[PDB]
Symmetry: C3
Subunit: 189 residues, 3 copies
């Protein structure tokens, strides 16, 4: 297996010296740089850059600058995804985002883990834990979502939350660590 | 009522499709973008942009870039307001800031709420809760202030706090959620 | 003593009106601005700017933009220091960073304290508390480290932590406030 294949299979992989992955990160970083330095009202240029970054034809994916991601192609997006300023989709592990998702400012979706033991960590190895973000979700500002976490459809994550464990669907959850407070009634009004 | 009037009256409003509000946000974002790409030592240009953004003649309002706001004209500023890097004044609800206010880096003042029910939320409606920041306050870095919250004059908010409830005057408060720890003696030395 | 000498000796100092300190902050801010607007793949230019900012010849110090610091020369760096996006080394108090240190995105290392009493604070005085970051450490994203704090060698700080007190070596610590969870086995594999 290549290092990319290991990354995508939830195995330890050589994040810092694999030329392929280095080059893919450099690609994404230069696109993010361009995007971050494109006037917000330059709508068509921004859409072109976002589509290049994610290697897809987005449908109402609104990205407020600055934005960051590692690979771009490893973020799978639904339609109607609203991403406020200063978010980071750290996507060595796939980040899957459903439809109708409101992401507040200063949110980090972190898929990278390093070894605890410094001898192994210092060698640059990582293990990626995918994040799944359900459709019909809302994240307040200043939220961090940790590796391997799933947020169920219909749920709301309060500002400042550190989401260390999976959140069931149709739930309001807040805190560090983030805990469910109560259910949400999402029936048709 | 217009959607702007609803926004300012703490009613649900059409944040995503009202052309007036869309256009006002676009104005503020383009000014922020220019400010964020202006050399920090270009004093006069930065003052001009800040005054254009807030639609006021500021008196020692120091904004360290990057900075973000939604409307600009809905942030009411005293004198001697020091805003460190990467703050966001999300001002659909009025953000009122007193005199002599020290705001740390990476602070978010969030006035927006969305409906909890996804069917209503997906339609883009919001409800804004004003934030009032007393004079003579200090906020550490990485603070989030939530909708409708008031921070009393003379108070200090510890780094990393998530301010979910009003903070009395002359108080030190820390945490997620932010809680008063003790009183501050602000008597004249 | 000059105000710089007071700053470095953990005494109250005139942070806002001392011309030397003002000028040194301006130097660092203009370099950061240039760095933050340099294409990420412009390796040589970035290295030159980083080395000018820190006034040292760095050895595998990787800075992902945006980055911020106050003085730059008051950050003492080891080799193999990896700093992800949107960090701020607020370095009126010295920030000492060891070798083989992984710093996640949106981390703030804050050495500045202000007076609690607003009359003294409004005069602009500060007191700086150095931060020491041991070798062989890993910080998740969204971490704040407060003034005077030391993180021991071999330790890991979970994402979202607010590090208010010193962390012993070879420890895993998480939370707001950040608390040791358990020891890390760092034995040579
Ligand atoms: C999601 C949100 C609306 C939930 O707030 P709510 O619906 O009013 O929540 P509740 O009424 O159930 O919770 C009240 C209690 O939970 C606590 N709480 C609420 N939100 C909290 C949060 N984000 N973090 C920690 N505690 C929180 C309060 O301290 C309060 O405690 P109490 O028993 O002492 O009164 C809110 O947390 C939020 O994220 N608002 C910020 C909005 C924002 O980030 N802006 C928009 C960008 S997407
Ligand atoms: C506001 C601040 C100075 C208060 O600190 P302080 O006056 O020394 O606080 P106290 O001694 O009263 O509080 C001590 C206790 O509260 C806790 N505490 C203090 N600050 C805290 C914070 N920001 N978050 C959570 N807990 C905190 C400590 O863990 C400690 O626990 P202990 O009882 O086990 O000792 C500090 O929280 C702060 O924000 N420092 C960072 C400054 C900063 O962000 N830089 C400048 C940018 S504006
Ligand atoms: C450092 C880190 C790996 C520790 O996670 P871990 O090794 O699985 O640690 P543990 O097994 O001790 O954690 C399990 C428990 O701790 C809690 N916990 C874990 N990380 C936490 C955090 N950052 N904040 C608060 N609580 C946390 C969980 O809520 C869980 O509680 P439980 O008893 O109910 O199960 C992780 O916190 C982390 O920072 N991950 C994010 C990585 C990141 O930021 N990306 C890379 C950039 S540097
Ligand atoms: Cl938002
Ligand atoms: Cl491990
Ligand atoms: Cl500050
Ligand atoms: Cl609601
Ligand atoms: Cl990282
Ligand atoms: Cl004091």
């Amino acid at each position: 297996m290549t290092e990319k294949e290991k990354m995508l299979a939830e195995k330890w992989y050589d994040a810092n010296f694999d030329q392929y992955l280095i080059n893919e990160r450099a690609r994404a970083k230069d696109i993010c740089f361009e995007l971050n330095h494109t006037r917000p009202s330059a709508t068509n240029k921004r859409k072109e850059l976002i589509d290049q970054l994610f290697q897809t034809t987005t449908d109402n994916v609104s990205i407020s600058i600055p934005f960051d991601t590692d690979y771009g192609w490893n973020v799978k997006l639904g339609k109607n995804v609203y991403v406020n300023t200063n978010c980071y989709f750290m996507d060595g592990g796939q980040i899957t985002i459903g439809d109708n998702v409101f992401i507040g400012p200063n949110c980090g979706f972190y898929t990278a883990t390093h070894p605890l033991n410094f001898h192994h960590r210092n060698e640059g190895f990582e293990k990626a834990g995918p994040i799944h973000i359900g459709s019909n979700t809302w994240f307040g500002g200043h939220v961090a979502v940790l590796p391997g976490v799933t947020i169920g459809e219909g749920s709301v994550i309060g500002a400042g939350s550190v989401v260390t464990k999976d959140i069931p669907p149709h739930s309001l959850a807040v805190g560090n660590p983030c805990k469910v407070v109560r259910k949400i009634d999402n029936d048709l009004p």
